């Protein structure tokens, strides 16, 4: 977009950072060449507080008054410049468009008894018509003019318009082309589409033929959720789930329908996890995104049997995958086009109703096996901008409004590309309207907000209120149980609240909305995903087992290990700002007083429900891969498997909300791909036969990985690094056991900061702490005249020992001596021979824990 350094902030005020200012307008975009010239006098009252609160980054700008004689509604449809006498620049219009034309009425389609209405917000447009098609691929049948009122274009037609397909013909000034262009655009409020969103389907989302059997009774069948503190999350990509599952019919692999195959290997796997206690599945982007063709017959994919013949450390597999990666069935989907419609490529038929019905059937099916469904929502950026292409919708209709721009008028791209501006009224409105669409129309149980730091906190909080007030009687869903969390990363143009108070980790403290705890992730794994890949952490051999490629000294690494242990313990106690820990110096510190290496407070939340504890996710290296990179090369795969289990167990037995990447439980590899978003089914394989974990399938794609190929190649080629079926199955068995343990006692899932401060203590702390061991005790009411509520009818105390040392340790804890501790019944019965050797001795309060083991001890009541 061109140079635009001035802002039209309200109907009567323009803001521009100058030290004789005039406004020029041309309806034909001919600019000399203007239709209208207007002198702007300096406004001695300056910018109102409402303006500076909305746009903090321009609070220093001088104010200029637009005379009340000006027809603002007409001028915003023109090419506009302001001039200072000579400096000429364009005008950024969102302020005035909101001030004059903010609209809360119906958008998209409204169905009444005898009519269908369409409304489009397009306040800068010179004309809007609707072009109707009979059929998803047929020719235009008729064009109907819409009428404008206050920036909204509308038309009401007969009920027979239902199930037509349509597009809007929008005549609008596009700054990138310096022309008024006739753009063919989909409906921002679309609820279904033809293939690839080429046209919008004029569907009544409430139509009974779009509901699976018993859909209206789904609320009655949903899994009970007593508390947000009972949540565990499993993060899964829809295509990954079934792309390689031979127990699913070829036709139904990779999409929504595979979730309706009860006895498939995949659904049996999810059943196993759900029955162990898993509560929520977080599905990667499942709305209309670009980068995958909805027409399956257009897909190109490599012969996997061919690629299997190539050497494990070769660059040939990735070259083959990359050659057709833009035309294959595969993308994570963080490329938003239209938020309110299910992705067509995941439907059996991308035209008509199947994408709606099959999405609903997926939610129903997951609910019926005991899993609530979370959507990964991506409101922070758009795939495309500008007037051209099927994949640009929002910016095609109202250019320069839905996207955030810098102070020169250029689109901000920190999110990926085409950052949105949730600070603008109709963007905020669309986001919340979309969330309510998914909650009511699809009965979705929660939302993970991609780049939540790019979203205004006021949008997050309004979304929370709107969702959690939905009721079964009025909306068919219990909104009180809908859970929100997100990745509250604070960077680029939204950092330091520059565009308003944003959804950063620190800003979302005390909101009851969760955020990913990167502190526990980095302390466990070591380093960070964008630092040195060989930097070790608490669970990857720092100090105890140096890898010999990296390091510092060993008083360095001993203290570095202890520093990481402190960070982990704060996270294990819900990552609270006010939780007090005896730190490794011996000084007692609040969680917020302990800092990361970038000076960030480690603990920042006001509640465990605000913490999403993780070591792995779709981004960056899988758990198995990060362990395989960072640990000494000489470790056996058997040892690394125990290390995998330790990491996932630290999550599963933490206070807060545990988050697992799909495949944590089965040693999933991507052959060390750090960003597999476009790396195809080959690198992203999820193998529910358990025969392979996808280690050693070639060097991963060069685009994101080539700099690290030298460390990857020898490991990928080393047969000693590759697990067998037995290892994979053992990992799954111990994973399920640890989930069962979490759900065996309410003590692991405390619901408030007060409860955690009262009940949770760590017993291996201070300057003489034993390296590589964390001991965590959780107390319940005991004796007559109890001190606290009794939460657990079975156990009066639980102790977890995490031992990352390669050798057995004995921890003597006097505070826990002379008690009735025994190994947890689940671990007494474990298929793992080692954990069964764990023991407690009352005389000394001694907990004996084998090397590379997590041992859970319980004090039974009576």
Ligand X SMILES: OC[C@H]1O[C@H](O[C@H]2[C@H](O)[C@@H](O)[C@@H](O[C@H]3[C@H](O)[C@@H](O)[C@@H](O)O[C@@H]3CO)O[C@@H]2CO[C@H]2O[C@H](CO)[C@@H](O[C@H]3O[C@H](CO)[C@@H](O[C@H]4O[C@H](CO)[C@@H](O)[C@H](O)[C@H]4O)[C@H](O)[C@H]3O)[C@H](O)[C@H]2O)[C@H](O)[C@@H](O)[C@@H]1O
State whether residue 270 is helix, strand or coil.
helix
Q: Can you tell me which of 65, 211, 272, 704 binds ligand X, judged by CB under 6 A?
A: 704
Contacts of 531 (CB under 8 A, 6+ apart): none
Q: How far is the CB of 678 from Ca ion (least distance, A)?
A: 5
Q: Can you tell me which of 70, 416, 580, 781 binds ligand X, judged by CB under 6 A?
A: 416
- Paired with 70 in beta bridges are none
Q: Can you tell me which of 43, 171, 304, 619 binds ligand X, judged by CB under 6 A?
A: 619
Question: How far apart are alpha carbons 765 and 20 in whole angstroms?
Answer: 68
User: Footprint of Ca ion on residues 309-338 (CB under 5 A)?
Assistant: 325, 328, 330-331
- Paired with 254 in beta bridges are none
Please give the C-alpha separations between residue 401 and each of 269, 424, 426, 550, in angstroms, as whole numbers.
Answer: 45, 8, 9, 48
370 assigned ligand-binding residue: yes
Q: How far is the CB of 324 from Ca ion (least distance, A)?
A: 8
Q: How far is the CB of 528 from ligand X (least distance, A)?
A: 6
Q: How far is the CB of 298 from Ca ion (least distance, A)?
A: 12
812 assigned ligand-binding residue: no
Closest CA to 196 of 121, 103, 297: 297
8 A C-beta contact, residue 774 and residue 801? yes
Select 331 or 620, whichever has its Cβ closest to Ca ion.
331
763 binds, among ligand X, Ca ion, none (CB under 5 to 8 A by kind): none
8 A C-beta contact, residue 573 and residue 591? yes
Give the number of residues in contact with ligand X, rule: CB under 6 A.
21
278 assigned ligand-binding residue: yes
- 450 belongs to the binding site for ligand X (CB under 6 A): yes
8 A C-beta contact, residue 860 and residue 792? no
State whether residue 600 is helix, strand or coil.
coil
Strands 483-486, 446-449: parallel, antiparallel or unpaired by DSSP?
parallel
- 518 belongs to the binding site for ligand X (CB under 6 A): yes
325 assigned ligand-binding residue: yes
Q: Can you tell me which of 417, 506, 534, 817 binds ligand X, judged by CB under 6 A?
A: 417
Question: How far apart are alpha carbons 429 and 419 in whole angstroms?
Answer: 16
564 assigned ligand-binding residue: no
- 628 belongs to the binding site for Ca ion (CB under 5 A): no
391 binds, among ligand X, Ca ion, none (CB under 5 to 8 A by kind): none
Q: What is the pattern of x (binds ligand X, CB under 6 A) and - over residues 550-589?
A: ----------------------------------------
Total count of residues recorded for the chain? 862
- 99 belongs to the binding site for ligand X (CB under 6 A): no
CA angle in degrees (0–180, nearest 5) for 52-57-61: 70
User: Footprint of ligand X on residues 322-351 (CB under 6 A)?
Assistant: 332, 334-335
619 binds, among Ca ion, ligand X, none (CB under 5 to 8 A by kind): ligand X
Q: How many other CB atoms are found less than 10 A from the CB of residue 73?
A: 14
Select 106 or 531, whichever has its Cβ closest to ligand X.
531
Question: How far apart are alpha carbons 162 and 205 in whole angstroms?
Answer: 11
- 192 belongs to the binding site for Ca ion (CB under 5 A): no
Contacts of 71 (CB under 8 A, 6+ apart): none
Binding window for ligand X (CB under 6 A); candidates: 549-557, 612-620, 640-648, 652-660: 612-620
- 675 belongs to the binding site for Ca ion (CB under 5 A): no
User: Footprint of Ca ion on residues 752-811 (CB under 5 A)?
Assistant: none
State whether residue 584 is helix, strand or coil.
coil
User: Footprint of ligand X on residues 352-411 (CB under 6 A)?
Assistant: 378
507 assigned ligand-binding residue: no
493 binds, among Ca ion, ligand X, none (CB under 5 to 8 A by kind): none
Q: How far is the CB of 122 from ligand X (least distance, A)?
A: 26
Closest CA to 851 of 683, 684, 554, 639: 639
- 666 belongs to the binding site for ligand X (CB under 6 A): no
CA angle in degrees (0–180, nearest 5) for 338-228-667: 75
Please give the C-alpha separations between residue 733 and each of 327, 662, 673, in angstroms, as whole numbers.
Answer: 38, 15, 26
Q: How far is the CB of 702 from ligand X (least distance, A)?
A: 13
**Residue 476 CB-half CA count within 13 A:** 16
Binding window for ligand X (CB under 6 A); candidates: 256-264, 361-369, 415-423, 641-649: 415-423
Select 85 or 530, whichever has its Cβ closest to ligand X.
530
User: DSSP secondary-structure letter at 190?
Assistant: -
Question: How far apart are alpha carbons 215 and 364 in whole angstroms?
Answer: 8
Q: How far is the CB of 222 from ligand X (least distance, A)?
A: 27
Question: How far apart are alpha carbons 99 and 9 in whole angstroms?
Answer: 8
Q: How far is the CB of 282 from ligand X (least distance, A)?
A: 11
Closest CA to 178 of 8, 421, 16, 386: 386
Q: How far is the CB of 337 from ligand X (least distance, A)?
A: 12
- Residue ranges in 333-452 assigned as alpha helix (H): 354-368, 394-397, 425-441
Select 284 or 363, whichever has its Cβ closest to Ca ion.
284
State whether residue 505 is helix, strand or coil.
coil
State whether residue 768 is helix, strand or coil.
coil
- 607 belongs to the binding site for Ca ion (CB under 5 A): no
Q: How many other CB atoms are found less than 10 A from the CB of residue 260?
A: 18
The continuous run of DSSP H or E covering 244 comes out as: none
Q: How far is the CB of 421 from Ca ion (least distance, A)?
A: 28
Q: How far is the CB of 414 from ligand X (least distance, A)?
A: 8
What Rg, from alpha-carbon coordinates, does the chain have? Answer: 29
256 binds, among ligand X, Ca ion, none (CB under 5 to 8 A by kind): none
- 662 belongs to the binding site for ligand X (CB under 6 A): no
Closest CA to 137 of 182, 193, 177: 193
325 binds, among Ca ion, ligand X, none (CB under 5 to 8 A by kind): Ca ion
Q: How far is the CB of 212 from ligand X (least distance, A)?
A: 30
Q: Can you tell me which of 51, 75, 356, 415 binds ligand X, judged by CB under 6 A?
A: 415
Q: Can you tell me which of 10, 124, 317, 678 binds Ca ion, judged by CB under 5 A?
A: 678
317 assigned ligand-binding residue: no
Residues at the binding site are 274, 278, 325, 328, 330, 370, 678
* Residue ranges in contact with ligand X by CB under 6 A: 332, 334-335, 378, 415-417, 450-451, 487, 489, 491, 518, 528-529, 618-620, 675, 677, 704
Residues at the binding site for Ca(2+) are 274, 278, 325, 328, 330, 370, 678
* Residue ranges in contact with Ca ion by CB under 5 A: 325, 328, 330-331, 678
């Amino acid at each position: 977009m061109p140079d635009a350094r001035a802002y039209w902030v309200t109907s009567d005020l323009i803001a521009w950072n100058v030290g004789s200012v005039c406004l020029y307008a041309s309806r034909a975009a001919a600019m000399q060449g203007y239709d209208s010239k207007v002198e702007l006098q300096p406004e001695s009252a300056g910018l109102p507080e409402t303006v500076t609160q909305k746009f903090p980054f321009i609070s220093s700008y001088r104010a200029f008054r637009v005379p009340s004689s000006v027809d603002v509604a007409s001028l915003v449809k023109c090419q506009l410049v302001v001039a200072s006498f000579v400096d000429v620049t364009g005008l950024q219009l969102p302020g005035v468009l909101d001030d004059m034309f903010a609209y809360t009425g119906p958008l998209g389609a409204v169905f009444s008894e005898d009519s269908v209405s369409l409304h489009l917000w397009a306040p800068t447009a010179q004309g809007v018509s609707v072009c109707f098609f009979d059929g998803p691929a047929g020719p235009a049948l008729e064009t109907v003019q819409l009428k404008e009122s206050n920036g909204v274009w509308s038309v009401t037609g007969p009920r027979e318009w239902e199930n037509r397909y349509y597009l809007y013909e929008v005549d609008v000034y596009h700054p990138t082309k310096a022309q008024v262009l006739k753009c063919l655009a989909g409906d921002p409020y679309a609820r279904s589409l033809s293939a690839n969103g080429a046209r919008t389907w004029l569907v009544d989302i409430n139509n009974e033929t779009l509901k699976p059997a018993s859909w209206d009774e789904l609320a009655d069948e949903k899994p009970k959720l007593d508390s947000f503190s009972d949540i565990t999350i499993y993060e899964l990509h829809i295509r990954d789930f079934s792309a390689h599952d031979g127990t699913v019919d070829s036709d139904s692999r990779g999409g929504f329908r595979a979730f309706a195959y009860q006895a498939s290997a995949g659904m049996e796997h999810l059943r196993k996890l759900s029955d162990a206690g898993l509560t929520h599945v977080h599905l990667l982007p499942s709305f209309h995104f670009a980068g995958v063709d909805d027409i399956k017959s257009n897909w190109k994919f490599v012969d996997e049997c061919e690629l299997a013949t190539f050497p494990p450390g070769s660059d040939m597999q990735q070259a083959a995958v990359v050659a057709i990666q833009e035309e294959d069935p595969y993308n994570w989907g963080y490329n938003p086009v239209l938020w309110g419609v299910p992705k067509g490529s995941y439907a059996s038929d991308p035209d008509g109703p199947s994408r709606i019905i099959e999405y609903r059937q997926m939610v129903q099916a997951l609910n019926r096996i005991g899993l609530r469904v979370v959507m990964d929502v991506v409101y922070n950026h758009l795939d495309s901008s500008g007037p051209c292409g099927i994949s640009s919708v929002l910016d095609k209709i109202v250019p320069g409004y839905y996207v955030r721009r810098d102070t020169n008028g250029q689109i901000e791209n920190s999110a990926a590309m085409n950052n949105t501006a949730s600070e603008h009224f109709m963007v905020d409105r669309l986001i919340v309207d979309d969330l309510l669409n998914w909650a009511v129309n699809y009965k979705v149980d929660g939302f993970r907000f991609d780049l939540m730091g790019h979203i205004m906190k006021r949008t997050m909080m309004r979304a929370k209120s709107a969702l959690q007030s939905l009721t079964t009687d009025a909306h068919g869903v219990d909104g009180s149980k809908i859970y929100l969390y997100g990745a509250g990363w604070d960077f680029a143009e939204v950092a330091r609240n520059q565009r308003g108070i944003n959804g950063s980790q620190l800003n979302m403290s005390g909101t009851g909305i969760g955020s990913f705890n990167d502190r526990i992730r980095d302390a466990i794994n070591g380093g960070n995903p964008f630092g040195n890949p060989l930097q070790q952490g608490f669970n990857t051999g720092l100090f105890l087992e140096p890898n010999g490629f990296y390091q510092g000294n060993e008083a360095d690494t001993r203290r570095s290990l202890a520093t990481y242990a402190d960070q982990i313990q704060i996270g294990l106690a819900g990552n609270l700002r006010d939780y007090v820990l005896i730190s490794h110096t011996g000084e007692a510190k609040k969680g917020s007083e302990i800092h990361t290496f970038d000076g960030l407070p480690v603990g920042y939340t006001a509640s465990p429900i605000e913490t999403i504890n993780y070591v792995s996710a779709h981004d960056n290296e899988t758990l198995f891969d990060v362990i395989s990179v960072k640990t000494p090369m000489i470790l056996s795969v058997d040892e690394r498997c125990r290390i995998n289990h330790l990491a996932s167990s630290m999550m599963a037995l933490s206070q807060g909300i545990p988050f697992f990447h799909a495949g944590d439980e089965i040693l999933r590899s991507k052959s060390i791909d750090r960003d597999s978003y476009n790396s195809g089914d080959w690198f992203n394989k999820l193998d529910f036969t358990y025969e392979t974990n996808n280690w050693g399938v070639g060097l991963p794609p060069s685009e994101k990985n080539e700099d690290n190929w030298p460390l990857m190649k020898p490991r990928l080629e080393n047969p000693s690094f590759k697990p067998a079926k037995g290892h994979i199955l053992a990992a799954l068995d111990s994973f399920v056991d640890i989930l069962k343990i979490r759900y065996s006692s309410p003590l692991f899932r405390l619901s408030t900061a007060n409860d955690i401060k009262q009940r949770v203590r760590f017993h291996n702390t201070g300057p003489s702490l034993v390296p590589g061991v964390i001991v965590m005790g959780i107390e319940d009411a005991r004796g007559e005249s109890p001190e606290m509520a009794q939460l657990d009818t079975n156990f009066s105390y639980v102790v977890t020992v995490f031992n990352v040392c390669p050798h057995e340790v004995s921890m003597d804890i006097p505070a826990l001596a002379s008690m009735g501790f025994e190994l947890h019944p689940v671990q007494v019965n474990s298929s793992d021979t080692l954990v069964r050797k764990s023991a407690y001795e009352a005389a000394t309060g001694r907990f004996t824990v084998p090397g590379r083991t997590v041992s859970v001890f319980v004090e039974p009541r009576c």
